[PDB]
Design a protein around this ligand. Structure first.
Ligand SMILES: NS(=O)(=O)C[C@H]1COc2cc(F)ccc2N1C(=O)c1ccc2c(c1)NC(=O)CO2
Lengths: 242, 10
C-alpha cells in the first residue's frame, strides 16, 4: 500500500526558531520564514529519497523537481498544519510561530497570507483527509517540469500517472465529484505559488536593502530556479487547463 | 557538488 508508506514517511514538524523578544519587523519575520523554509527543504530531500518511485528518476530530474516544487510543497504543508492544528483559523507556520492579523501585516505579505488562508479554508470545506493530503503532496512534487521536458520524461510520466491512479482509488473512501474537487484544488496551487515566488524573488534580489536573510539551501535553490522561472522555462502541469 | 546534490546522493 503506497499510501500507507506516505503516511509513515511524513516528516516531524519543525520549529521556526522565532525570537519574540526581537522587534516584529518585516526583516525579522521574513528571515525567520526563510530559516524555516531551509529546514523544511532538508526534510523534503529526506522524504523524496524514500518516496516510492522517486529513486527511479535520474539525479538531474530529482533536483529539477525539488527546485521547481519547493514553494508548492511548502505552501500546501502550511495549509495542512493550519487546518489540522487551528481548523484553518490561523496560519500555523510552526508550533512557535502562528500568525494572527498582526503578524500577517508585519510580514509585509498580508495579501499573500490571506491567499494562503483561502486554501486552508478549502481544506475545511472539503474535510480533506490525511490520506488525500499525502497523495496530493506527491502530485505537487510532480507538478512543475522544464518546458523542454525532463531527462527521463517517460519515467516521470509513469510515476505521476501512478500517483493520479492512487488519488482516484482513495476518493472512493469519502466519488467522481470528490476527485474533481481535489484536482481543482491542486490546480489552484499554481496561481498562489506564482505570487509567493514573485515576492520571494523580489526580496532575494533586494536582500540587504530590505535586511531579509536567506539560508544556504535557499540561496542555492533560488539562484538556480529564479532565472528559469523568469525566462519561462518552468512548465506548470494542470489537470484542467484554465 | 551543490547542497541539493550532496543530500540526494548521501
Ligand atoms: N516555509 S514556510 O514559511 O513554512 C511556508 C512557505 C510557503 O508558503 C508560504 C505562504 C505564506 F503566506 C508566507 C510564506 C510562505 N512560505 C515561505 O517560505 C515564503 C514565501 C514567500 C517569501 C518568503 C518565504 N520569504 C521572503 O523573503 C518573502 O517571500
Amino acid at each position: 500500500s503506497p499510501v500507507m508508506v506516505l503516511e509513515n514517511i511524513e516528516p516531524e514538524i519543525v520549529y521556526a526558531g522565532y525570537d519574540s523578544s526581537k522587534p516584529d519587523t518585516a526583516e525579522n519575520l521574513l528571515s525567520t520564514l526563510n530559516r524555516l523554509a531551509g529546514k523544511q527543504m532538508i526534510q523534503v530531500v529526506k522524504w523524496a529519497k524514500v518516496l516510492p518511485g522517486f529513486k527511479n528518476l535520474p539525479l538531474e530530474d530529482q533536483i529539477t523537481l525539488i527546485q521547481y516544487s519547493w514553494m508548492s510543497l511548502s505552501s500546501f504543508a502550511l495549509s495542512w498544519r493550519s487546518y489540522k492544528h487551528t481548523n484553518s483559523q490561523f496560519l500555523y507556520f510552526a508550533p512557535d510561530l502562528v500568525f494572527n492579523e498582526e503578524k500577517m501585516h508585519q510580514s509585509a505579505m498580508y495579501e499573500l497570507c490571506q491567499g494562503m488562508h483561502q486554501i486552508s479554508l478549502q481544506f475545511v470545506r472539503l474535510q480533506l483527509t490525511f490520506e488525500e493530503y499525502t497523495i496530493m503532496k506527491v502530485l505537487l512534487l510532480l507538478s512543475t517540469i522544464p518546458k523542454d521536458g525532463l531527462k527521463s520524461q517517460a519515467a516521470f510520466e509513469e510515476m505521476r500517472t501512478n500517483y493520479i491512479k492512487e488519488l482516484r482509488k482513495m476518493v472512493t473512501k469519502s466519488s467522481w465529484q470528490r476527485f474533481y474537487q481535489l484536482t481543482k484544488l491542486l490546480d489552484s496551487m499554481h496561481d498562489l505559488v506564482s505570487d509567493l515566488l514573485e515576492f520571494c524573488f523580489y526580496t532575494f534580489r533586494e536582500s540587504h536593502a530590505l535586511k531579509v536573510e536567506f539560508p544556504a539551501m535557499l540561496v542555492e535553490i533560488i539562484s538556480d530556479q529564479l532565472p528559469k522561472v523568469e525566462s519561462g522555462n518552468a512548465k506548470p502541469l494542470y489537470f484542467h487547463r484554465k | 557538488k551543490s547542497l541539493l546534490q550532496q543530500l540526494l546522493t548521501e
